[PDB]
Paper text:
GLIC, a prokaryotic ligand-gated ion channel found in Gloeobacter violaceus, served as a model system to comprehend the gating mechanism of eukaryotic ligand-gated channels. The overall architecture of GLIC is similar to the existing structures with each monomer featuring two domains: the ECD, mainly composed of β strands and the TMD, composed of four α helices (M1-M4). In this study, we present cryo-EM structures of GLIC reconstituted in lipid nanodiscs at pH 7.5, 5.5, 4.0, and 2.5. We identified a resting-like state, two putative intermediate states, a putative pre-open state, and an open state.
Numbering used by the authors:
A (entry chain C), B (entry chain D), C (entry chain E), D (entry chain A), E (entry chain B): 5 to 317
Write the structure that this text describes.
């Protein structure tokens, strides 16, 4: 139970990789998801006398966990990973293929700035426990990293898992911490939201806009205010799906725009009624005719501007 | 505590089966349910010297857990199953009937594509721990698999449990993993939903449709918009029972159809009022008479089309 | 730590009883409640040499838990009961009075078919661990079963605890399992629900019924539809108290009846307006006068029929 | 590890007291709160040879937990208290001052019968573990009981903690159980509820009452029914703060009174409209003038009666 | 495992400091947040013979946890901190640099008196375990206290962590307890709340205020009451973001002011209608013209007064 002696006086290259098995239950509210995968490391200790016999009659040698194993810890996870050791084998004067089955509650933030069509990346970092004087450096093994076993999570389509970048950070000016980064690139399927969150609100707004084709003040007032109440009720209904973040959101500005449009519609209706009362029917009709075309065009232009602001640039 | 020597050089056939005892609390939101059942395996080790005495005076021999027992693990469950060993007996040069009482929080997905009348299947897979060189293959024992002990869960009617299929999958190109599949086929009782989720919404829509039999613009506007608000409030009320999935749902399209019908009704009322104002009473009456028959017929045809789309084909 | 030898070759009669101490927190949604009580068994082993000295100078002998104690397990509970041994004493060639203080989360179903005035029964079953060949049969000791220590739970009034029935069931055609049943008969106090769930809804319906004493179509429409919206809002407000079950409920049919009455009222108002427009004032007045008396009488008759259906028969 | 011999043949007086340190998070819904305090017992064993040396050179003697310590258990708490032993010292032929730091989730019921201005008392009972034949009786030590260390909990003002009563109860006719009662007397601060739960509802009711100063039937109907809907919505809004109990509540009857007032207002408006239609303007005006004064006076009288009923008597 | 002998007869100065690493998930409702940081103490024991060899060939000496380590406990946290020892080294006749990686659920109250623009301070206290007679006094080490490693939490901007004050409190008149205070000064970003909680309510109120520019009593009543209902619905919608405290809140008085304004608007509309009915059109017009200017000016003045009350003074 000791690190191999530094005869070469060089850090041991503990190559590692993760083969995803089954991931599910991505909770947006808690920013948590489950991960089940393989952990395959290939740390080599030839000078530790870990059976470097060089005997062909005893190839594929098997050893228990009595020898020291480089401990790997996940910074993201808040609980200890349930480890299940599978294979502990070393070749004659070769490397050790030590595999494990693990499940953990890995933590990762989310970016709800493009909520209907967002493209978050899922992060997993791991660290090594540097003990004694033998430096331990983590490398990337491209052979045993991937997810090609038909894994799926509802609402998303996986596209990449082999980012395998190594952003060696710093902490209290420490010597070295590799902190291998495993990026799980995912995208959201948006077809279930168009007829659920967007179209019902647009229909309510369009129902509101019909007040310009009438001349009854009571009917216009009832239409507009009851439509506003219906919009508030729908916003209450779809509160769970909508995200609540302390920053601006693309889906969080359309609602404010809708409120502004309701206020402007109320002001326009009141102005029309006042002008009609003050005996200016020609001016009232001109204002109504102008508004009929001004409202939807302004709405479309503002939506285009907001899309170009949040997306694109 | 060693696997039996492979004198025959063949994998040991560990026959197994599950006798359901009590299952309850199927939570649709978390896709979890409780299972209490028997686990009866019949693994045979004649060459392991596990009392193959062939003595009639000592039949029905009893042994403790000192001998090795093939460990069986459930991939679905997220926690260790509470095991209660009952019988450990071997016949002279026979097999071992090792029974257990277990309770676990087995996980399984659900398909909310036909929510009022869905027919989900409940999955349970188990795996064996291949140790040393003696291959372990899992088989199906039809004698001790079933649920015929008057087990019930509220809202469902069980119909089948003996699917006992063996879909041997692959993981990292491993040698063999039987992964026996235990399918619990269930169906939902829908009579408690017709007078709770469907009829109250249809009644609200029918109340909305009565606006075509009136000529008061203010009354029509109040009727339609307040009916829309009532529909939104009812949707809020029945949110818990309705499922929220990232895919299309049969019960998730009727609501969108209802919103579309409300929008079309508002447009029709506005058109009628505008035509009446513009001194076209004959055209207004013709439009109203046409709409009176066009609305329910179109609704019925669209419902039939949606039913033929989601169900049937 | 061995069962007493079957010198008489008869099963040992382990008499037992439960003296309730403090029960509280009956959660209807989770169908769970806390129970704190005494467990007093009187299993006798005279031939086990468990101090059958027959010495008057050493009466009321005290022994530790070194001797075997018949393990008692509760099938209902999902967790191990926190056991606190109090007295372990045997009389000379007598029985052992082994008492314990236990608290457990015992599970039991509920019948929400008469929710305002329901009379559920609370079930507790226990089983014995049959070991070796000495058969163990559970009996009922009427001396130490009861709750006469001023125990109360909010909202209910206890009436019986000494049902002490023994419904010996079967499981995989086993030899014997006594499975003593302890029925806790309780009833619900309904005076806090009449002015909270029933009267506010009846008042809303009565407010709706006043539309028949008016001739303004706009006023009638506003009254009826806004009353329907208020009823929906109240149903949302009292959702937590109301039960959600996959079967028919007495309180679950009155709501459907109320929706039907709202729909019929809307139809009647529309018919009256149409007849008045079509120049049939006498027929409109006759219809209104008939409806004024027909509505409450039909409502009362339907309520009586529903009461006779759910209750009584 | 044995109780002191009863040379005097008298029960040992284990004086005890609790010095509150920090209490917080009183959850009304779960009836739970956190308590951190000191536990100082002064049980004396002179005849147990627990260092009764009577040597002045070794005063303030220190001993470890090797000697037996009378176990103290809290019936209210559902979990074991995290104990932190601080001082274990005995004077020469004196007593033992054994102090501890403990934190527990102590349970206690609440009385929501005067919710805005309630004065609940917070209960803590403790019991002793009577072992062997040496009787253990719990007493009260007024020296080390109190809370004078500037402890506060939000929304309440503590007024008393030294009730230190000893209601020795009975359980299965046991010999003796002191069951010391520690009453924490608290009161609620009500100034944050007057402008949050009471005044907004009174304002809504007053808005409703303005219908008597108008003659438009449609306006009166809209006013009253929309005000009722607003009241229901506010009740939904303040549901969390309001308590839900299976008994009558002072704040639970004002709401029913408000519903009754809404119903009576609707009836009065309908009666006025019917009388005006039936050509009785003088009677309609007289009824309106009478109601204008009858409504607020009756409301005030009923509120006074309800206050005198729930409070006072 | 003994404290160093007090040869100097002076308390040992155990200097300590916390270097923040990663803090996140500040839950306002539960007043909890996660903290991951370094714990670096520099307690010195030269007279304890903890390798005071004064040998230059063995500088940077390494020792295991066999020697006693001063236990540090956090009063705020409700759970034991997960400790990970990193470095245990002593210089020849020097001090011990004992570092640890810890994560804990530290508790701290919040002041929701300026909720949109609040400036809470986050508190962390630690205590030492005084054992034997060697007094232990906690000091502050400014070298290893800070957060300069690019740590961020959503919605807040950290500004200070090195308060490192030492408010030595008292408990039962104890000798000494340093109770070092670590203040984490944070501020809230308010730009995400202006277009989400404030502007939508101001727009609703402004929509309400348009009733003064009309003469239709029915239209005015519908406008005002439906606007009030919409305001209640919005308050329900934004309930989660708003804080619920038993004391007055800046955001908790604006709502009451809005309710008062709605009530006054209803009263004004009723007064105008009554005066118009009683044939006083000049007085009605004068009242309307006065109110048009009186309402917004009074609202602005009251808002300024409330701001000067809660903020500033
Ligand atoms: C109308 C809807 C407005 C949506 C604004 C979205 C900003 C996105 C962004 O990038 O904003 C970045 C930052 C801070 O915002 P943040 O802390 O990133 O959130 O904006 C600002 O300083 C304000 C810039 C936008 C001002 C818009 C004024 C409109 C007046 C009418
Ligand atoms: C009044 C409506 C005005 C609409 C103006 C444009 C609004 C959308 C801007 C986001 C575009 C974008 O970029 O969508 C993100 C992704 C591509 O993802 P990407 O590669 O990151 O880009 O595209 C899409 O899924 C395109 C789907 C567009 C759906 C629009 C529904 C509109 C319904 C109108 C019914 C009358
Ligand atoms: C009106 C209601 C429409 C309900 C559509 C149900 C589709 C079910 C399905 O099989 O849809 C499969 C997929 C994706 O949908 P998914 O990812 O499986 O969910 O549909 C599509 O590409 C779109 C096909 C339906 C288009 C309907 C257009 C109606 C315009 C008016
Ligand atoms: C305006 C109403 C139009 C209705 C048109 C048809 C809609 C239903 C389509 C699903 C059929 C189906 O398949 O129902 C699934 C299952 C069989 O399950 P399966 O073997 O998978 O098929 O049948 C059933 O439980 C049939 C129950 C039908 C209830 C319909 C209630 C309608 C109330 C109308 C009051 C005026
Ligand atoms: C109007 C309200 C109707 C309430 C019906 C209560 C049934 C109680 C019961 O005993 O119903 C038992 C079963 C199934 O119901 P279940 O699975 O026990 O729930 O009913 C049925 O097969 C239907 C019987 C009732 C039909 C009512 C038709 C009314 C048309 C108008
Ligand atoms: C329009 C109203 C029509 C009412 C017709 C009858 C409905 C109730 C039927 C259940 C009877 C029953 O059995 O109530 C169950 C239990 C006895 O329990 P048990 O021994 O199981 O019977 O009795 C009770 O607590 C009787 C309480 C009756 C309260 C009724 C309130 C009605 C308010 C009306 C205000 C104008
Ligand atoms: C109108 C609002 C009425 C509030 C009644 C408060 C009772 C408080 C109490 O002490 O009631 C005690 C008990 C049970 O009530 P409980 O089980 O303690 O709750 O009342 C009763 O038997 C009924 C007494 C009150 C009857 C009121 C009738 C009003 C008709 C109009
Ligand atoms: C729970 C059901 C309650 C029903 C109450 C119905 C009230 C109807 C009022 C007009 C009928 C009528 O004719 O009242 C006759 C007389 C005068 O009439 P007159 O001058 O003699 O002609 O009116 C009044 O003094 C009206 C007094 C109204 C008091 C309301 C009290 C509400 C308490 C809650
Ligand atoms: C229409 C309004 C009618 C009001 C009639 C009386 C209702 C209150 C009865 C409880 C009295 C009591 O006892 O209040 C309990 C405690 C004392 O606690 P104690 O020692 O237990 O008594 O006093 C208090 O905090 C008094 C506070 C009274 C606040 C009343 C607000 C009313 C606002 C009206 C705006 C127009
Ligand atoms: C209108 C909105 C009024 C908001 C008052 C904010 C007080 C803040 C504070 O400092 O109040 C401190 C304390 C208690 O309040 P607390 O326990 O700190 O909460 O106020 C009081 O004794 C009352 C002082 C305010 C009285 C306002 C009367 C308005 C009548 C119209
Ligand atoms: C009718 C509207 C009347 C407004 C009168 C003043 C209300 C605000 C008082 C708090 C000031 C303060 O102090 O804001 C706290 C902090 C500084 O924090 P500090 O150093 O603690 O101060 O300033 C700010 O972020 C200033 C932001 C002000 C936003 C105001 C939005 C108003 C929108 C109006 C659209 C027509």
């Amino acid at each position: 139970v000791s690190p191999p002696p530094p005869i070469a006086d060089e850090p041991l290259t503990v190559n590692t990789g993760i083969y995803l098995i089954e991931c599910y239950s991505l909770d947006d509210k808690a920013e948590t998801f489950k991960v089940n995968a393989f952990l395959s490391l290939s740390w080599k200790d030839r000078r530790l006398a870990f059976d470097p016999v060089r005997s062909g009659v005893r190839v594929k040698t098997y050893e228990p966990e009595a020898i020291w194993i480089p401990e790997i810890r996940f910074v993201n996870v808040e609980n200890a990973r349930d480890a299940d050791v599978v294979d502990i084998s070393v070749s004659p004067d070769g490397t050790v293929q030590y595999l494990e089955r693990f499940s953990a509650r890995v933590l990762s933030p989310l970016d709800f700035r493009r909520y209907p069509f967002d493209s978050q990346t899922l992060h997993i970092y791991l660290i090594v426990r540097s003990v004694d004087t033998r430096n331990i450096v983590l490398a990337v093994d491209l052979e045993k990293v991937g997810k090609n076993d038909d894994v799926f999570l509802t609402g998303w389509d996986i596209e990449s898992f082999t980012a395998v970048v190594k952003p060696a950070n710093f902490a209290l000016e420490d010597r070295l911490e590799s902190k291998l980064d495993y990026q799980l690139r995912i995208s959201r399927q948006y077809f279930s939201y168009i007829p659920n969150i967007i179209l019902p609100m647009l229909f309510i707004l369009f129902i509101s806009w019909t007040a310009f084709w009438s001349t009854s003040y009571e009917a216009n007032v009832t239409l507009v205010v009851s439509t506003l109440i219906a919009h508030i009720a729908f916003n209450i209904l779809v509160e769970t799906n909508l995200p609540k973040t302390p920053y601006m959101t693309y889906t969080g500005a359309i609602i404010f725009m809708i409120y502004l449009f309701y206020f402007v519609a109320v002001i326009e209706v009141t102005v029309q009624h006042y002008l009609k009362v003050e005996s200016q029917p020609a001016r009232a009709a001109s204002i109504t005719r102008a508004s009929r075309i001004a409202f939807p065009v302004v709405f479309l232009l503002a939506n285009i501007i907001l899309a170009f602001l949040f997306f694109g640039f």
